[PDB]
Amino acid sequence: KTIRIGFVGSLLFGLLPRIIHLYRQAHPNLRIELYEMGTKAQTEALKEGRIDAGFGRLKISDPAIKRTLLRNERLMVAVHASHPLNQMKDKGVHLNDLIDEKILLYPSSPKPNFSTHVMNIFSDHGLEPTKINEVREVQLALGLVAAGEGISLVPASTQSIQLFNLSYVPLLDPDAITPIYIAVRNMEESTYIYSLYETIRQIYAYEGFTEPP
Amino acid sequence: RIASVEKTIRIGFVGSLLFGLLPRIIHLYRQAHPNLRIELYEMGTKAQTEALKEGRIDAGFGRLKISDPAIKRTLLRNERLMVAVHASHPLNQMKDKGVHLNDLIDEKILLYPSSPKPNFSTHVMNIFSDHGLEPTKINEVREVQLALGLVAAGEGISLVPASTQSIQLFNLSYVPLLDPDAITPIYIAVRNMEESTYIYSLYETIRQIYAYEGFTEPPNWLEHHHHH
Numbered sequence A: 001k002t003i004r005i006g007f008v009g010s011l012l013f014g015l016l017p018r019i020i021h022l023y024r025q026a027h028p029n030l031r032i033e034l035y036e037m038g039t040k041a042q043t044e045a046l047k048e049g050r051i052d053a054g055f056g057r058l059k060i061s062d063p064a065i066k067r068t069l070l071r072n073e074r075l076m077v078a079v080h081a082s083h084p085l086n087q088m089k090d091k092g093v094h095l096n097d098l099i100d101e102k103i104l105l106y107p108s109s110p111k112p113n114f115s116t117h118v119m120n121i122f123s124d125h126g127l128e129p130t131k132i133n134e135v136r137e138v139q140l141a142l143g144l145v146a147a148g149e150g151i152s153l154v155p156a157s158t159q160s161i162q163l164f165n166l167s168y169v170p171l172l173d174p175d176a177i178t179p180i181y182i183a184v185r186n187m188e189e190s191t192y193i194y195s196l197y198e199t200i201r202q203i204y205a206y207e208g209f210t211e212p213p
Numbered sequence B: 001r002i003a004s005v006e007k008t009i010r011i012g013f014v015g016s017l018l019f020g021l022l023p024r025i026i027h028l029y030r031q032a033h034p035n036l037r038i039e040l041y042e043m044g045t046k047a048q049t050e051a052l053k054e055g056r057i058d059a060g061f062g063r064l065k066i067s068d069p070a071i072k073r074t075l076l077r078n079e080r081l082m083v084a085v086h087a088s089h090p091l092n093q094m095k096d097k098g099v100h101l102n103d104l105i106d107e108k109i110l111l112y113p114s115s116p117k118p119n120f121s122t123h124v125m126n127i128f129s130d131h132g133l134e135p136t137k138i139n140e141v142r143e144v145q146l147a148l149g150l151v152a153a154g155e156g157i158s159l160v161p162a163s164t165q166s167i168q169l170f171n172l173s174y175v176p177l178l179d180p181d182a183i184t185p186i187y188i189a190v191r192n193m194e195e196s197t198y199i200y201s202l203y204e205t206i207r208q209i210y211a212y213e214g215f216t217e218p219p220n221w222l223e224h225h226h227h228h
């Protein structure tokens, strides 16, 4: 009668609430508890039994955890309206266009985290952006972009944040992605966790996303 | 090549203000003062006081009035409150017209934040009790984004600043709150001394954007008058 879910903050701005809402409709007397935490912290939390399921954006390998890829969400570049990158609808924008920009990454919690994921995509292609500043969370990064502080790379679903003179630019590199995983304990076999997984599949089928296994 | 400490201006702000007018104010300020280095620091109102006193920041944007002899402040405006509700909540049918505080008393209300005190939740609760209203279903959460997320999940409602409308979550609706005192103040605080020329310029920028937005302000609001 109590399910504990760990989640990275950005998911609040995307599909997480509609999943929980449909999930609620199937379980009118379940106590649902949500806890914002990083993907590495979710792994430790699952092992200690502090949460039952974790929704994250890193693939942390650990025998005690069963991890499953839900979908490959795209990354976008958040910029101020007047930024030159916002003038490139014609040809579009690649990662190698971003290398000399002031880039705002997040979170500032211990590594590995979302900024490590983003920097790895650069390094995967021999790119190393030299001007990086780490901030607490995605909404702060975006507010700072709007204030004129630089640019940021964010999941496409954070476009629910529509700040004055903030524009989101697509990235052309096919691997400019931020996958979303569900993680549970390796011998998890609960009805509640199965139902949660089916609820995600119902939203995806309705939303037109590719179904996970 | 590095900028001088004299031409560096440090600005403290509460995080939720990034959803309203603060960013365009800062952007415009930067654009009009290209030889200034502006540094921005997220901090709560209480921390802003010690920071101003010690020189760690030069101006602080906050939502609380915490009196300290070393500091002075100007009320920039009283921002309206709204009720964040799930699209399918009955209260959402009064979205065009708005609702009153006494309509919310038996609703599942999500208050926030958790840590600081006094905060937004006590201020919200004080507006209820100012009118002999005591909400019976109070659940407190850590932060505004989790409150909004749980409302979007249909687990309750939350009273939020009007600028929160920048965050448009799926199946989340913002309903106007009609009580004229259902407001939340925004302040600029500075050291209790004559404002530097740089802070006076920041005042000028605020006045400019507030005029573009059409806000009503009293005579001599934020206005510098010469000492000679």
Ligand SMILES: O=C(O)/C=C\C=C/C(=O)O
Pocket (backbone or CB within 6 Å): A008, A009, A010, A011, A038, A039, A040, A056, A057, A058, A106, A107, A112, A113, A114, A115, A138
């Ligand atoms: O750090 C990580 O493990 C991943 C994501 C963090 C934050 C977010 O998506 O908002």
